[PDB]
Every structure is written in structure tokens, then in C-alpha cells.
Design a protein around this ligand. Structure first.
Ligand SMILES: CCc1ccc(CCOc2ccc(C[C@H]3SC(=O)NC3=O)cc2)nc1
Ligand SMILES: [Zn+2]
Length: 258
């Protein structure tokens, strides 16, 4: 009986195994746009992905992860609210059963169809496992997906999903360029938070871009054909793998833009 996104093991149950679920800096949150305050001291984000080395795509039973070589400073996030250098380790998405839900963050209570998370770790802690034990260990870049025009840079991801349908399947996924998943603007909101899955560690500086990317209905329909289950188990579609908004508590969301 492990955690997941069902009635019996979903987000409302996670606190029993992971009491930090009821902590002071949990993610995601609702971004109240009128309340977020413009912080003119925030720097432009620096997204340096031209030397990114993708390696593999994995169905881990909760999402699919596109994994990168993080054994050197190739693909790094710097600037914005961050001190120092954060290496890209993986990206994944959260998505819904329907276009009207799927995102983890919300904007004035609006849910997007999906949300992309590019996960980076602070190189001053040496490895990812040490970084998640630190309050400034990770930086996650969150990007909303809305359904409209196709995202050309997503199609190579969509087309490999047939090969990792079930939990524990992986496939080689080299030479994928994550710059193809970014919107035009790097305007963002930022706040201190957590991992949005168990173990729910409070180690994340969240950077959520204001501008969504557009994906096609066909692209997100292919996400929804993935399975939570392993091969040879009853089929459980991988949909609604999102944690809902958590209480903001004693936090301020800052905007990089007016
Ligand atoms: C390199 C080996 C390693 C591996 C995982 C962990 C602890 C768990 O860490 C994590 C577990 C889940 C996630 C994904 C979370 S956080 C987010 O933004 N969205 C998710 O789904 C991110 C980190 N420690 C060490
Ligand atoms: Zn995530």
C-alpha cells in the first residue's frame, strides 16, 4: 500500500507516511496574481541549456522522467532568485484526465492542462541526495501547458511514450534539447516550497514562468495513454498525477515583472 494518486493512496493520505505533508513550506500553491509583489531586486533568470546531454526516459509509475547527465556543469539554471549554480538532472510533467485540470500550481485558482517541472540541484552540495536535505538544495522551473497549437519541441517526447507505457520501463533518449519546451518570456513568480511528491522535502526554490506553452490535444492525449501499473498488471491510466494547492502559510510569492 504505497503512495500514489488514487482514492486510497492519493495526496490526502500522504501525511500518514510523510508528516511533512502538513509542513510550513509545502508545494504546490495557488499563485494569487494581484497579491504577488513585484520585486525589482530579482534578476533575470539565466537558463543555459545549449550543452544539455539527455540520456534516458523512464516511466517511474508516477510520471515519466527525461534524465540528463548532471556529472558536470552542462545544463544549468542561475540568476533569478538563486545564489550559485543549479544543474539540470531531469524534467517531467503532471497532467489531468481532462484539459481543465492537471497543473499543480494554479494561477488565480485556474488549473492548466499540465505542468512541466525542470528539476535542478545546487552544485555546492555535491550530489542530488545531499541537495534535497538543504533548504536551498533544488530549483524547479515550472512551466504551464495549455491545449491549443502543437509544441514542435515536445513531439520527440510524445513519440517515445509508446515504448515506456508501464512502470519500470525506460528507453534511450539522447540528443533531446529542452530549449524547445520554453515559452518566449522568462518572466516568473518565485517562492520557497517543497517537492510535490513524497518525500515532500522542503528543499525547493520554485520558479514558475508566467507564460504557458501551447501543446496540441493530440500531444496531451498521448500522455494520458501511459500507465501507472507495471507490465502484466491491470491497466490504470496515468492521469491526474498532480498534487493540489497547499496552504501558503507564512510565505510571499514574488514576481519578476510588473
Ligand atoms: C540521485 C538519487 C536520489 C533520488 C531521489 C532522492 C530523494 C527524493 O527526491 C525527489 C523525489 C521526487 C522528485 C519529483 C517531485 S519534485 C517536483 O517538482 N515534482 C515531482 O514530481 C524530486 C526529488 N534522493 C536521491
Ligand atoms: Zn513535478
Amino acid at each position: 500500500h504505497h503512495w500514489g494518486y488514487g482514492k486510497h493512496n492519493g495526496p490526502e493520505h500522504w501525511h500518514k507516511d510523510f508528516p511533512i505533508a502538513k509542513g510550513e513550506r509545502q508545494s504546490p500553491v495557488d499563485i494569487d496574481t494581484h497579491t504577488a509583489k513585484y520585486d525589482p531586486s530579482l534578476k533575470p533568470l539565466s537558463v543555459s541549456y545549449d550543452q544539455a546531454t539527455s540520456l534516458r526516459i523512464l516511466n517511474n509509475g508516477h510520471a515519466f522522467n527525461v534524465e540528463f547527465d548532471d556529472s558536470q556543469d552542462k545544463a544549468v539554471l542561475k540568476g533569478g532568485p538563486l545564489d550559485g549554480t543549479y544543474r539540470l538532472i531531469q524534467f517531467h510533467f503532471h497532467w489531468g484526465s481532462l484539459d481543465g485540470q492537471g497543473s499543480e500550481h494554479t494561477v488565480d485558482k485556474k488549473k492548466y492542462a499540465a505542468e512541466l517541472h525542470l528539476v535542478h540541484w545546487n552544485t555546492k552540495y555535491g550530489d542530488f541526495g545531499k541537495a534535497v536535505q538543504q533548504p536551498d538544495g533544488l530549483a524547479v522551473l515550472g512551466i504551464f501547458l495549455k491545449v491549443g497549437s502543437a509544441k514542435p519541441g515536445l513531439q520527440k517526447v510524445v513519440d517515445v511514450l509508446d515504448s515506456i507505457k508501464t512502470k519500470g520501463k525506460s528507453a534511450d533518449f539522447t540528443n533531446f534539447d529542452p530549449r524547445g519546451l520554453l515559452p518566449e518570456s522568462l518572466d516568473y513568480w518565485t517562492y520557497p516550497g517543497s517537492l510535490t511528491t513524497p518525500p515532500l522535502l522542503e528543499c525547493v526554490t520554485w520558479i514558475v514562468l508566467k507564460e504557458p506553452i501551447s501543446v496540441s490535444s493530440e500531444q496531451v492525449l498521448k500522455f494520458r495513454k501511459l500507465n501507472f501499473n507495471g507490465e502484466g498488471e491491470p491497466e490504470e491510466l496515468m492521469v491526474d498525477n498532480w498534487r493540489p494547492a497547499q496552504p501558503l502559510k507564512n510565505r510571499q510569492i514574488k514576481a519578476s515583472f510588473k
